[PDB]
Amino acid sequence: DRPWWGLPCTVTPCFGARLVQEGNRLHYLADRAGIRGLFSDADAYHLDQAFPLLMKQLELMLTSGELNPRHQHTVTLYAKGLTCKADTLSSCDYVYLAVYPTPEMKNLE
Ligand SMILES: [Cl-]
Ligand SMILES: [Mg+2]
Numbered sequence: 180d181r182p183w184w185g186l187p188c189t190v191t192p193c194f195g196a197r198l199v200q201e202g203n204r205l206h207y208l209a210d211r212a213g214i215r216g217l218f219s220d221a222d223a224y225h226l227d228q229a230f231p232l233l234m235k236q237l238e239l240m241l242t243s244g245e246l247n248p249r250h251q252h253t254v255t256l257y258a259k260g261l262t263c264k265a266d267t268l269s270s271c272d273y274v275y276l277a278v279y280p281t282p283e284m285k286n287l288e
Contacts, residue, residue, distance in 0.1 A: 184211045186253070186264050188277035192216030194226055198234075198274040200267065203242040205234055205274055222260060222280050229258035237265055237274055246274060257281070 185195015196212035198205045207230075218226060236256055240246040246254055248271045256263040258278075265276040 181213045183215065184213060184275070186266055186268075186275040186277040188215075188264065188279065190277070190279040190282070192218045192222075193277055193279040194218070195277050196275075198237070198276065200241065200248055200270075200272060200274050203238055205238050205241070207234065218280070225259040225261055226278055229261065233258065233263055233276075233278070237276070241274075248272070 183195050184197040185193070188195065193215045194212070195215065196207065198207055198211075200206075233256060237246060237254075240254060241248075246252070246265065246267055248267045249269055251266060251269045253264055253266040256265070260281055261278055262281045263276060263278045265274055267274050
C-alpha cells in the first residue's frame with residue numbers, strides 16, 4: 180500500500196505531504212502525499228480549497244523565518260474546520276505537513 184509522507188500524526192482521517200523546500204519556495208508533489216482514512220465530503224472540499232492558501236502561508240513563514248529548515252519547530256495553521264501542522268523537522272530539504280479535521284471537544288459540546 181502507500182507509505183506516509185506527512186508530519187507524524189495519529190489523527191484520522193489525515194492528509195499528509197512532504198513539500199520540497201527550495202529557498203522560500205515550497206513545491207507540492209502528489210506522489211509525496213496521501214490520505215489516511217476517509218474525509219467527509221465537506222472536509223475534503225475545504226482541504227482542497229484551502230491548500231493553495233496553506234502553501235502560501237507556509238512560504239510566508241519561510242521568508243519571515245518562522246519556519247526554519249535547520250530547526251525542528253511545529254507551526255499551526257487553520258482552515259474551515261481543519262487544523263494544519265507543518266515542520267521542516269530540521270531537514271534542510273522539506274516541510275512536512277499534516278492536515279486533519281479539527282477535533283471536536285466532545286466533553287464540552
Ligand atoms: Cl505518523
Ligand atoms: Mg520547523
